[PDB]
């Protein structure tokens, strides 16, 4: 019929309009949306957003209402998904990543494999890298039985963005059962360093901060061509027995190599704190992909407002329902 969604919900920012452009396009349901980020700083549809609507639009033929810098305002039906070879471009530092997001899930679905270019901004603090989509969450999602593969092909840093990632995908066999528990004993730590334009010595305070923290059995320190932006990026990737996780945090001005760090540091021991297998951000990340295979759990400290997010939103669309019961501080997840 029409599902009405409000943008206000949880923390107010394009989550939840990623969210339902996925599972608009996977289900045909048709969906409006008000109040499009209008509460943030720059409200309404921005680069990354439109980017978003305009993929997913192209990808099923769908009917549109408010594709346009700075709406709040949306109404989407969607057409049918058609599997193809597609290139976008943002036009600003805006996520290529997040852009993915949306478009990708439908694919999954499709005639045959696709592929999909984004090009735009590559190492944006608050969207899942590159390197976590690729070393973090597909392997996960290989384990549900969905299969794709994303590279990134040129960074691109705020402010000038034109970076370039792409996914290649294809259409799910069949789906299994991913059921994660705790995140087991640690089998070993990475962490790295990206310079573009930035002092070669800055990674080397940073590697340093991280060792004396914690064993790294790979310390690694990548430069790339200063006209690829000034740009300054610290990972630290931590795999465990049960689980792989990877945090990052992006070097601005007025900040010390050594506080970066140490902002990475404390994010990496909130995830130690406790036996959760699945970091902050991930987690929101696995809600859908979890409810279209009609299975699998995970467990969560905290669980945040884009989890819960996307669980109404998956619960809007789809005819699961999501439990969540919390024993000892940890939050288990699972498809009911
Ligand atoms: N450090 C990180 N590592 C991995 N993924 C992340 C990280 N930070 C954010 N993400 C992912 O990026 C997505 C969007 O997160 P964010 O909270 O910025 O949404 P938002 O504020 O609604 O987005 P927008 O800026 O488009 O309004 C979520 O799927 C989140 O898990």
Redesign the pocket.
């Known amino acids: 019929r029409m599902i009405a969604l409000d943008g206000a919900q949880?923390?107010?920012?394009?989550?939840?309009?990623?969210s339902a452009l996925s599972l608009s396009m996977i289900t045909g349901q048709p969906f409006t949306i008000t109040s499009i980020?209008a509460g943030?700083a720059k409200p309404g549809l921005?680069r990354?957003?439109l980017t978003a609507v305009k993929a997913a639009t192209e990808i099923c033929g769908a009917t549109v209402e408010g594709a346009e810098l700075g709406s709040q305002r949306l109404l989407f039906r969607p057409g049918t998904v058609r599997g193809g070879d597609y290139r976008f471009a943002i036009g600003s530092a805006?996520?290529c990543?997040?852009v993915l997001?949306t478009v990708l899930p439908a694919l999954w679905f499709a005639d045959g494999p696709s592929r999909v270019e984004v090009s735009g901004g590559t190492d944006?603090?608050?969207?899942?890298?590159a390197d976590?989509i690729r070393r973090?969450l597909e392997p996960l999602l290989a384990k549900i039985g969905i299969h794709q593969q994303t590279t990134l092909l040129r960074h691109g840093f705020y402010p000038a963005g034109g970076g370039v990632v792409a996914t290649e995908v294809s259409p799910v066999a069949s789906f299994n059962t991913l059921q994660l528990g705790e995140r087991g004993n640690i089998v070993q730590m990475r962490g790295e360093v990206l310079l573009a334009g930035v002092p070669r010595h800055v990674a080397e305070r940073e590697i340093a901060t991280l060792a004396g923290s914690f064993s790294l059995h790979e310390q690694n320190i990548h430069n790339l061509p200063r006209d690829q932006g000034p740009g300054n990026t610290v990972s630290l990737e931590v795999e465990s027995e049960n689980i792989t996780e990877?945090?990052?945090?992006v070097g601005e001005k007025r900040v010390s190599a050594e506080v970066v760090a140490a902002q990475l540091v404390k994010?990496v021991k909130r995830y130690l704190a406790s036996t959760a297998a699945v970091?902050?951000?991930?987690?929101?990340?696995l809600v859908l992909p979890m409810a279209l295979a009609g299975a699998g759990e995970f467990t969560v400290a905290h669980p945040?407002?884009?989890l819960l997010?996307?669980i109404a939103v998956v619960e809007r669309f789809l005819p699961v329902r999501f439990s969540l019961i919390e024993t000892d501080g940890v939050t288990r997840v699972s498809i009911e």
Do not use: M
């Open positions: 949880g923390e107010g920012g394009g989550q939840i309009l990623r980020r943030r921005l990354q957003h805006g996520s990543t997040l997001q944006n603090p608050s969207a899942p890298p976590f973090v990877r945090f990052f945090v994010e970091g902050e951000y991930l987690a929101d990340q945040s407002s884009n997010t996307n």
